[PDB]
Amino acid sequence: LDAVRKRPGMYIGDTDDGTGLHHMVFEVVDNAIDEALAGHCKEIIVTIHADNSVSVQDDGRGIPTGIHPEEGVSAAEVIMTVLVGVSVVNALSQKLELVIQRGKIHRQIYEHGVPQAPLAVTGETEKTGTMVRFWPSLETFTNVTEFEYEILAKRLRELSFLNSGVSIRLRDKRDGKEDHFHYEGGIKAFVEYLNKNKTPIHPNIFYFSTEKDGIGVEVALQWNDGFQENIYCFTNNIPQRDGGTHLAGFRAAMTRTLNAYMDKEGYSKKAKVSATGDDAREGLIAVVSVKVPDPKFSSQTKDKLVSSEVKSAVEQQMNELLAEYLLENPTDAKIVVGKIIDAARAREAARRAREMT
Ligand SMILES: O=C(O)CNC(=O)c1ccc(NC(=O)c2cc(Br)c(Br)[nH]2)cc1
C-alpha cells in the first residue's frame, strides 16, 4: 500500500491527464461486474456526487464479513488492504466509505488505505449488496481532479454491451444528468448501436460465441453503405486501441473466407477482378472480444495484444463460422459480395489509369 502511494502511475494509470482518476471508478465497477458474471448482481448504480466523490452500489451478495484467522480482520478488510484490485483504489483515496448489506448493515471508513476502526455492524437490513464511495487523494491526482460524465458514460455503456445482461445506471448529482445502460443483445447490440446513425446494407448481423483451446472468441459484424473500417477489439473486456493478434486473425480469416466464397460461387471470374483485404474492410463495423487466461500485451497500457496463440484461435473460428454464415444467409452474402466487387473494380480501374498514360 505504501508502494502503491509511492508509484501511483504504475498501478492505476497516468495521474495527470485524467486516465488514472477515472480508472479508480472502473476498478470498483469491475468488482461489481464480476459479481454479475457470478449471477448475483442484477444492477449497478454509479453516482458522481457534488463533493467530487464517486460511489458504486451493487445488489449482489455483499463482501464477506467473516473474519480472517491469520490476519485477525474482516475478509472485506483483506480485499480492501491487500494486493489491479480494490486496495489500489483504497490506497489512492483520501477517504473511502464501505457499506456491506449481507441480514445486517456493516460499515467501515478508510483514510489513505488505513482503517479508522474495524468493520462494525451499524444496523439491520433485509436487502443485500455492497456500496463503495471514495474521495480521490489530491496528493496523488493532479491537473484533472474532477470526474467527467462522458468518460464514465462511454465505458459503462460498452461494459453493458460486453457483459450480456447487466444493468448499469449512471447519476450526476452536480447537474441531474442520468443514464441507464442494459443491452441484453450484448456485442450484437454493440454493432447495432455502432450502425444506428449509419445505413446497414443487409439485415442479418453475423455473430458467434465459442471456446477452443482455452480461448473465448466472440465476434459480431455488419457492413454499412459507407467506406470506413471500424473494428473494436477487446481482451478480457479491456480495449486494444492499436489492435494486435486478435485483429490480425480476424482480418486473415475474413479475406480468406470472402475470397473463397467469391471464387467458388463464380463472382471473381465474371467480374474479372481479384479482391483484396482492403476491399472487404470498406463499410465494415465489427467487435472482436476475446477471453484469454494469461494475456500478453506490448506494454502496461494494453493498447496492443501480442499473444500469438490468439491469432490462430480467432482465425480458425472466424473461417469456419463466417463460411457457415455466408451459405446460410445467401441474400446477405449477395449484397456484401456485390459491394466488395465494386470496390475491387474501382481500385483496379484506378491503378490501371495511373500506368495507362
Ligand atoms: O469468500 C467467499 O467464499 C465467497 N465470496 C463471494 O462470493 C464474494 C461476493 C461479493 C464480493 N464483492 C463484490 O461483489 C463487490 C466488491 C466491490 Br468493490 C463491489 Br461495489 N462489489 C466478493 C466476494
Tab-separated table of C-alpha atoms and ligand atoms in Angstrom:
chain	number	residue	atom	x	y	z
A	1	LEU	CA	0.000	0.000	0.000
A	2	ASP	CA	2.971	2.328	0.665
A	3	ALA	CA	4.453	1.114	-2.658
A	4	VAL	CA	1.164	1.975	-4.433
A	5	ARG	CA	1.207	5.533	-2.977
A	6	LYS	CA	4.916	5.868	-3.941
A	7	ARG	CA	4.355	4.959	-7.635
A	8	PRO	CA	0.598	5.538	-8.268
A	9	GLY	CA	1.034	5.861	-12.058
A	10	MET	CA	2.225	2.225	-12.270
A	11	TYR	CA	-0.904	0.707	-10.674
A	12	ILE	CA	-3.840	2.922	-11.788
A	13	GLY	CA	-2.539	4.777	-14.909
A	14	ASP	CA	-1.440	8.349	-15.706
A	15	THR	CA	-2.216	10.552	-12.651
A	16	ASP	CA	-2.251	13.932	-14.519
A	17	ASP	CA	-4.304	13.551	-17.752
A	18	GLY	CA	-7.405	12.029	-16.100
A	19	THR	CA	-6.687	8.394	-17.107
A	20	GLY	CA	-5.784	7.233	-13.590
A	21	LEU	CA	-8.602	9.193	-11.895
A	22	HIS	CA	-11.396	7.566	-13.966
A	23	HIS	CA	-9.760	4.123	-13.745
A	24	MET	CA	-10.415	4.414	-9.982
A	25	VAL	CA	-14.137	4.279	-10.856
A	26	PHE	CA	-13.771	1.442	-13.415
A	27	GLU	CA	-11.816	-0.774	-10.986
A	28	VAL	CA	-14.601	-0.590	-8.354
A	29	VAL	CA	-17.215	-1.178	-11.096
A	30	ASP	CA	-15.269	-4.237	-12.368
A	31	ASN	CA	-15.675	-5.879	-8.932
A	32	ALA	CA	-19.453	-5.387	-9.181
A	33	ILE	CA	-19.436	-6.802	-12.757
A	34	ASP	CA	-17.581	-9.957	-11.561
A	35	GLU	CA	-20.478	-10.500	-9.109
A	36	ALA	CA	-22.954	-10.046	-12.011
A	37	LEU	CA	-20.986	-12.646	-14.020
A	38	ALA	CA	-21.200	-14.975	-10.981
A	39	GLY	CA	-25.018	-14.494	-11.168
A	40	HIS	CA	-25.953	-12.444	-8.068
A	41	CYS	CA	-25.676	-8.760	-9.010
A	42	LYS	CA	-28.516	-7.663	-11.328
A	43	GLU	CA	-27.948	-3.878	-11.115
A	44	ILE	CA	-25.023	-1.493	-10.546
A	45	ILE	CA	-25.519	2.217	-9.718
A	46	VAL	CA	-22.618	4.649	-10.213
A	47	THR	CA	-23.128	8.157	-8.773
A	48	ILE	CA	-20.944	11.262	-9.217
A	49	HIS	CA	-21.570	13.220	-6.010
A	50	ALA	CA	-21.465	17.027	-5.667
A	51	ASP	CA	-18.391	16.874	-3.346
A	52	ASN	CA	-16.188	15.346	-6.120
A	53	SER	CA	-16.590	11.723	-4.945
A	54	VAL	CA	-17.967	8.685	-6.755
A	55	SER	CA	-19.973	5.794	-5.294
A	56	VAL	CA	-20.791	2.400	-6.768
A	57	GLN	CA	-23.738	0.398	-5.395
A	58	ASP	CA	-24.468	-3.215	-6.402
A	59	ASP	CA	-27.251	-5.591	-5.278
A	60	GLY	CA	-25.068	-8.739	-5.020
A	61	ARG	CA	-24.295	-10.982	-2.031
A	62	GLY	CA	-22.148	-8.397	-0.179
A	63	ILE	CA	-18.430	-8.730	0.626
A	64	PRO	CA	-17.773	-11.419	3.314
A	65	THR	CA	-17.731	-10.036	6.884
A	66	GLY	CA	-16.379	-13.369	8.247
A	67	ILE	CA	-13.067	-12.724	9.976
A	68	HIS	CA	-9.655	-13.994	8.812
A	69	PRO	CA	-7.925	-16.233	11.416
A	70	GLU	CA	-4.327	-15.483	10.293
A	71	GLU	CA	-4.829	-11.730	9.649
A	72	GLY	CA	-7.328	-11.203	12.513
A	73	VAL	CA	-9.528	-8.822	10.458
A	74	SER	CA	-12.751	-8.937	8.407
A	75	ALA	CA	-12.456	-10.611	4.974
A	76	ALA	CA	-13.707	-7.327	3.452
A	77	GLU	CA	-10.691	-5.548	5.001
A	78	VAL	CA	-8.372	-8.202	3.445
A	79	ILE	CA	-9.812	-7.395	-0.027
A	80	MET	CA	-9.550	-3.639	0.706
A	81	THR	CA	-5.970	-3.678	2.152
A	82	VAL	CA	-4.007	-6.478	0.334
A	83	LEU	CA	-2.874	-6.565	-3.328
A	84	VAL	CA	-5.438	-4.065	-10.204
A	85	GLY	CA	-7.539	-4.800	-7.079
A	86	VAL	CA	-9.746	-2.578	-4.888
A	87	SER	CA	-6.871	-1.946	-2.439
A	88	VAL	CA	-5.243	0.270	-5.131
A	89	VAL	CA	-8.373	2.458	-5.307
A	90	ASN	CA	-8.337	2.478	-1.477
A	91	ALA	CA	-4.623	3.385	-1.187
A	92	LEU	CA	-5.028	6.401	-3.522
A	93	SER	CA	-8.171	7.815	-1.835
A	94	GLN	CA	-8.077	10.489	0.895
A	95	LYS	CA	-11.235	8.782	2.228
A	96	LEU	CA	-13.201	5.622	1.332
A	97	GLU	CA	-16.598	4.539	2.741
A	98	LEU	CA	-17.522	0.824	2.647
A	99	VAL	CA	-21.129	-0.280	3.369
A	100	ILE	CA	-21.993	-4.007	3.246
A	101	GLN	CA	-25.558	-5.341	3.423
A	102	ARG	CA	-25.329	-9.121	3.941
A	103	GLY	CA	-29.189	-9.524	7.095
A	104	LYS	CA	-27.042	-6.833	8.742
A	105	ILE	CA	-25.535	-3.492	7.668
A	106	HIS	CA	-21.747	-3.345	8.158
A	107	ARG	CA	-19.779	-0.081	7.770
A	108	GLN	CA	-16.091	0.898	7.603
A	109	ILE	CA	-14.129	4.086	6.837
A	110	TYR	CA	-10.576	4.261	5.448
A	111	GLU	CA	-8.170	7.195	5.103
A	112	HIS	CA	-5.205	6.681	2.721
A	113	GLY	CA	-5.813	2.895	2.917
A	114	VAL	CA	-5.706	2.750	6.750
A	115	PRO	CA	-8.993	1.863	8.528
A	116	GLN	CA	-10.277	4.201	11.283
A	117	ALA	CA	-11.862	1.190	13.030
A	118	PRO	CA	-12.715	-2.482	12.296
A	119	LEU	CA	-15.751	-3.472	10.184
A	120	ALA	CA	-18.589	-2.753	12.665
A	121	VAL	CA	-22.333	-3.507	12.471
A	122	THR	CA	-24.296	-0.223	12.259
A	123	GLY	CA	-27.863	-1.568	11.941
A	124	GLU	CA	-30.243	-4.155	10.453
A	125	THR	CA	-31.423	-4.733	6.862
A	126	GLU	CA	-33.448	-7.002	4.557
A	127	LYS	CA	-31.519	-6.116	1.364
A	128	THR	CA	-28.148	-7.401	0.120
A	129	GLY	CA	-25.177	-5.802	-1.697
A	130	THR	CA	-22.044	-3.665	-1.458
A	131	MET	CA	-21.570	0.111	-1.608
A	132	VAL	CA	-18.141	1.737	-2.025
A	133	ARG	CA	-17.711	5.536	-2.068
A	134	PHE	CA	-14.275	7.157	-2.461
A	135	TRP	CA	-12.701	10.608	-2.387
A	136	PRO	CA	-9.598	10.520	-4.614
A	137	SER	CA	-6.413	11.857	-2.986
A	138	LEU	CA	-5.251	15.248	-4.310
A	139	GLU	CA	-1.730	14.257	-3.214
A	140	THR	CA	-1.864	11.581	-5.969
A	141	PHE	CA	-4.044	13.054	-8.748
A	142	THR	CA	-3.138	16.439	-10.302
A	143	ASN	CA	-4.442	18.730	-13.084
A	144	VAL	CA	-7.587	16.671	-13.930
A	145	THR	CA	-9.113	16.284	-10.441
A	146	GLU	CA	-12.860	16.418	-11.299
A	147	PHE	CA	-14.801	13.429	-12.635
A	148	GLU	CA	-16.135	13.717	-16.177
A	149	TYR	CA	-19.572	12.322	-17.016
A	150	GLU	CA	-18.971	11.482	-20.680
A	151	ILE	CA	-15.773	9.481	-19.924
A	152	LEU	CA	-17.642	7.348	-17.352
A	153	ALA	CA	-20.714	7.056	-19.634
A	154	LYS	CA	-18.760	5.803	-22.689
A	155	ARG	CA	-17.030	2.971	-20.760
A	156	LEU	CA	-20.042	1.843	-18.650
A	157	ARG	CA	-22.152	1.604	-21.826
A	158	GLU	CA	-19.518	-0.596	-23.502
A	159	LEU	CA	-19.246	-2.604	-20.238
A	160	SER	CA	-23.032	-3.222	-20.595
A	161	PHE	CA	-22.584	-4.379	-24.231
A	162	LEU	CA	-19.645	-6.568	-23.134
A	163	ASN	CA	-21.438	-8.193	-20.138
A	164	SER	CA	-24.627	-9.811	-21.559
A	165	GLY	CA	-27.493	-8.656	-19.256
A	166	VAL	CA	-26.040	-6.296	-16.644
A	167	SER	CA	-27.970	-3.121	-15.762
A	168	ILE	CA	-25.715	-0.103	-15.154
A	169	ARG	CA	-27.108	3.258	-14.032
A	170	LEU	CA	-25.053	6.477	-14.012
A	171	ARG	CA	-26.136	9.547	-11.983
A	172	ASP	CA	-24.545	13.021	-11.947
A	173	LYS	CA	-25.751	14.878	-8.847
A	174	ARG	CA	-23.875	18.075	-9.894
A	175	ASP	CA	-26.405	18.758	-12.711
A	176	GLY	CA	-29.057	15.952	-12.531
A	177	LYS	CA	-27.915	14.073	-15.685
A	178	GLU	CA	-28.887	10.371	-15.871
A	179	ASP	CA	-28.305	7.254	-17.986
A	180	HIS	CA	-29.437	3.618	-17.895
A	181	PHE	CA	-27.411	1.009	-19.839
A	182	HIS	CA	-28.841	-2.524	-20.125
A	183	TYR	CA	-28.234	-4.019	-23.584
A	184	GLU	CA	-29.454	-7.642	-23.448
A	185	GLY	CA	-28.341	-8.184	-27.091
A	186	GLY	CA	-24.692	-7.902	-25.959
A	187	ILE	CA	-21.956	-7.417	-28.587
A	188	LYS	CA	-24.611	-7.920	-31.297
A	189	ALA	CA	-26.383	-4.867	-29.772
A	190	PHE	CA	-22.953	-3.084	-29.737
A	191	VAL	CA	-22.839	-3.410	-33.549
A	192	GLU	CA	-26.470	-2.181	-33.855
A	193	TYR	CA	-25.569	0.860	-31.715
A	194	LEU	CA	-22.420	1.490	-33.805
A	195	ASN	CA	-24.547	1.308	-37.010
A	196	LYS	CA	-27.582	3.289	-35.675
A	197	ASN	CA	-26.580	6.551	-37.454
A	198	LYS	CA	-25.142	4.654	-40.479
A	199	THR	CA	-27.078	2.746	-43.198
A	200	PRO	CA	-26.740	-1.063	-42.813
A	201	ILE	CA	-26.866	-2.727	-46.268
A	202	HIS	CA	-28.020	-6.184	-45.067
A	203	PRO	CA	-30.362	-7.233	-42.206
A	204	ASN	CA	-28.541	-10.179	-40.535
A	205	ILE	CA	-25.672	-9.325	-38.178
A	206	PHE	CA	-23.038	-12.089	-38.213
A	207	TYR	CA	-22.415	-13.416	-34.696
A	208	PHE	CA	-20.831	-16.316	-32.806
A	209	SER	CA	-19.500	-17.132	-29.329
A	210	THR	CA	-17.096	-20.086	-28.984
A	211	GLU	CA	-14.329	-21.545	-26.801
A	212	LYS	CA	-11.378	-23.523	-28.258
A	213	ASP	CA	-8.018	-24.357	-26.588
A	214	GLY	CA	-8.857	-22.252	-23.506
A	215	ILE	CA	-9.574	-19.070	-25.519
A	216	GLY	CA	-13.042	-17.489	-25.703
A	217	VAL	CA	-13.748	-15.876	-29.090
A	218	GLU	CA	-16.826	-13.669	-29.579
A	219	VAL	CA	-17.402	-11.670	-32.780
A	220	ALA	CA	-20.192	-9.542	-34.230
A	221	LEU	CA	-20.056	-7.638	-37.539
A	222	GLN	CA	-22.200	-5.833	-40.116
A	223	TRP	CA	-21.474	-3.818	-43.291
A	224	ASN	CA	-22.877	-0.340	-43.989
A	225	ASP	CA	-23.118	1.651	-47.263
A	226	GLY	CA	-20.086	3.823	-46.340
A	227	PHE	CA	-16.384	3.123	-46.961
A	228	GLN	CA	-14.870	3.253	-43.433
A	229	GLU	CA	-13.410	0.371	-41.395
A	230	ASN	CA	-14.370	0.360	-37.686
A	231	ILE	CA	-13.187	-2.714	-35.779
A	232	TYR	CA	-13.287	-2.559	-31.948
A	233	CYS	CA	-11.010	-5.105	-30.215
A	234	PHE	CA	-11.142	-6.310	-26.581
A	235	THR	CA	-9.263	-8.807	-24.381
A	236	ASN	CA	-10.950	-9.742	-21.066
A	237	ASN	CA	-13.153	-6.639	-21.592
A	238	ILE	CA	-10.076	-4.340	-21.864
A	239	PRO	CA	-9.978	-2.410	-25.173
A	240	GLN	CA	-6.939	-2.548	-27.508
A	241	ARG	CA	-6.841	0.833	-29.302
A	242	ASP	CA	-3.940	-0.415	-31.501
A	243	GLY	CA	-5.352	-3.915	-32.182
A	244	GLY	CA	-2.907	-6.851	-32.163
A	245	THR	CA	-3.098	-10.612	-32.762
A	246	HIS	CA	-6.900	-10.761	-32.298
A	247	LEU	CA	-7.298	-8.177	-35.093
A	248	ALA	CA	-4.732	-9.903	-37.362
A	249	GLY	CA	-6.538	-13.265	-37.083
A	250	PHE	CA	-9.900	-11.568	-37.695
A	251	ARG	CA	-8.561	-9.844	-40.832
A	252	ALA	CA	-6.799	-13.011	-42.097
A	253	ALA	CA	-9.870	-15.275	-41.744
A	254	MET	CA	-12.057	-12.652	-43.415
A	255	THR	CA	-10.052	-12.058	-46.594
A	256	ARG	CA	-9.646	-15.841	-46.928
A	257	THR	CA	-13.347	-16.677	-46.367
A	258	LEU	CA	-14.772	-13.977	-48.670
A	259	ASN	CA	-12.253	-14.674	-51.467
A	260	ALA	CA	-13.014	-18.421	-51.183
A	261	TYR	CA	-16.754	-17.647	-51.426
A	262	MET	CA	-16.269	-15.216	-54.347
A	263	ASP	CA	-14.058	-17.780	-56.160
A	264	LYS	CA	-16.298	-20.843	-55.527
A	265	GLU	CA	-19.592	-19.092	-56.417
A	266	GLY	CA	-18.007	-17.648	-59.619
A	267	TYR	CA	-18.045	-13.923	-58.737
A	268	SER	CA	-14.314	-13.267	-59.334
A	269	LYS	CA	-14.430	-14.943	-62.782
A	270	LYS	CA	-17.457	-12.991	-64.093
A	271	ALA	CA	-16.113	-9.665	-62.751
A	272	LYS	CA	-12.526	-10.397	-63.966
A	273	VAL	CA	-11.160	-8.868	-60.722
A	274	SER	CA	-9.027	-10.084	-57.760
A	275	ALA	CA	-10.402	-8.784	-54.435
A	276	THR	CA	-8.082	-7.753	-51.566
A	277	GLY	CA	-8.424	-7.336	-47.788
A	278	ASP	CA	-8.899	-3.563	-48.221
A	279	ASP	CA	-11.985	-4.092	-50.451
A	280	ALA	CA	-13.708	-6.271	-47.805
A	281	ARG	CA	-12.899	-3.867	-44.933
A	282	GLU	CA	-14.759	-0.888	-46.517
A	283	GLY	CA	-18.049	-0.127	-44.701
A	284	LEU	CA	-17.301	-2.725	-42.009
A	285	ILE	CA	-18.340	-2.372	-38.385
A	286	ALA	CA	-17.166	-5.173	-36.087
A	287	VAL	CA	-16.476	-6.047	-32.446
A	288	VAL	CA	-13.930	-8.759	-31.581
A	289	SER	CA	-13.935	-9.772	-27.915
A	290	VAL	CA	-11.562	-12.490	-26.701
A	291	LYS	CA	-11.151	-14.209	-23.328
A	292	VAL	CA	-7.531	-15.149	-22.544
A	293	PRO	CA	-6.469	-16.589	-19.138
A	294	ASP	CA	-2.886	-15.174	-19.176
A	295	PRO	CA	-2.719	-12.494	-21.925
A	296	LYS	CA	0.483	-10.767	-23.117
A	297	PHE	CA	0.421	-7.080	-24.152
A	298	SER	CA	3.031	-4.808	-25.753
A	299	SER	CA	3.037	-2.526	-22.678
A	300	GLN	CA	1.223	-1.843	-19.392
A	301	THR	CA	-1.325	0.330	-21.300
A	302	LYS	CA	-2.761	-2.791	-23.026
A	303	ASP	CA	-3.297	-0.869	-26.298
A	304	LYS	CA	-1.915	-3.884	-28.257
A	305	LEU	CA	-2.308	-7.656	-27.719
A	306	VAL	CA	0.821	-9.722	-28.607
A	307	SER	CA	-0.319	-13.253	-27.554
A	308	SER	CA	0.476	-15.166	-30.763
A	309	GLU	CA	-1.877	-18.111	-29.996
A	310	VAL	CA	-4.874	-15.695	-30.013
A	311	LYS	CA	-4.375	-15.124	-33.787
A	312	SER	CA	-4.831	-18.822	-34.630
A	313	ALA	CA	-7.834	-19.190	-32.281
A	314	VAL	CA	-9.620	-16.178	-33.790
A	315	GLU	CA	-8.584	-17.027	-37.377
A	316	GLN	CA	-9.760	-20.660	-37.196
A	317	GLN	CA	-13.122	-19.885	-35.519
A	318	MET	CA	-13.831	-16.993	-37.935
A	319	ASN	CA	-13.042	-19.123	-41.014
A	320	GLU	CA	-15.446	-21.912	-40.024
A	321	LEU	CA	-18.329	-19.740	-38.763
A	322	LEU	CA	-18.193	-16.919	-41.371
A	323	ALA	CA	-18.259	-19.592	-44.108
A	324	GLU	CA	-21.354	-21.112	-42.419
A	325	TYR	CA	-22.929	-17.623	-42.217
A	326	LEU	CA	-22.461	-16.906	-45.953
A	327	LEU	CA	-24.104	-20.160	-47.115
A	328	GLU	CA	-26.971	-19.946	-44.569
A	329	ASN	CA	-27.699	-16.270	-45.424
A	330	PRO	CA	-27.359	-16.117	-49.249
A	331	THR	CA	-29.157	-12.740	-49.606
A	332	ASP	CA	-26.741	-11.085	-47.136
A	333	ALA	CA	-23.856	-12.836	-48.923
A	334	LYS	CA	-25.034	-11.455	-52.315
A	335	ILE	CA	-25.312	-7.839	-51.087
A	336	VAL	CA	-21.904	-7.863	-49.325
A	337	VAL	CA	-20.040	-9.508	-52.243
A	338	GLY	CA	-21.737	-7.039	-54.635
A	339	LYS	CA	-20.183	-4.141	-52.689
A	340	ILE	CA	-16.768	-5.868	-52.484
A	341	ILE	CA	-16.646	-6.472	-56.290
A	342	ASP	CA	-17.421	-2.781	-56.965
A	343	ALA	CA	-14.645	-1.662	-54.583
A	344	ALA	CA	-12.247	-4.077	-56.320
A	345	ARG	CA	-13.301	-2.767	-59.778
A	346	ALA	CA	-12.835	0.867	-58.675
A	347	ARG	CA	-9.376	0.216	-57.158
A	348	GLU	CA	-8.151	-1.877	-60.116
A	349	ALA	CA	-9.553	0.683	-62.596
A	350	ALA	CA	-7.728	3.475	-60.696
A	351	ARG	CA	-4.425	1.516	-60.656
A	352	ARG	CA	-4.913	0.819	-64.396
A	353	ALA	CA	-5.444	4.571	-65.024
A	354	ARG	CA	-2.080	5.622	-63.497
A	355	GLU	CA	0.022	3.259	-65.654
A	356	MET	CA	-2.023	3.872	-68.831
A	357	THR	CA	-0.562	7.341	-69.559
B	1	LIG	O1	-15.374	-15.535	0.207
B	1	LIG	C1	-16.214	-16.440	-0.324
B	1	LIG	O2	-16.041	-17.616	-0.108
B	1	LIG	C2	-17.374	-16.007	-1.189
B	1	LIG	N1	-17.282	-14.574	-1.525
B	1	LIG	C3	-18.031	-14.037	-2.515
B	1	LIG	O3	-18.795	-14.735	-3.148
B	1	LIG	C4	-17.937	-12.598	-2.836
B	1	LIG	C5	-19.102	-11.839	-3.043
B	1	LIG	C6	-19.015	-10.489	-3.340
B	1	LIG	C7	-17.763	-9.866	-3.460
B	1	LIG	N2	-17.596	-8.500	-3.729
B	1	LIG	C8	-18.347	-7.719	-4.557
B	1	LIG	O4	-19.299	-8.139	-5.188
B	1	LIG	C9	-18.014	-6.292	-4.684
B	1	LIG	C10	-16.794	-5.691	-4.466
B	1	LIG	C11	-16.944	-4.322	-4.690
B	1	LIG	BR1	-15.523	-3.084	-4.518
B	1	LIG	C12	-18.247	-4.095	-5.028
B	1	LIG	BR2	-19.095	-2.447	-5.445
B	1	LIG	N3	-18.892	-5.289	-5.025
B	1	LIG	C13	-16.606	-10.625	-3.236
B	1	LIG	C14	-16.686	-11.972	-2.937
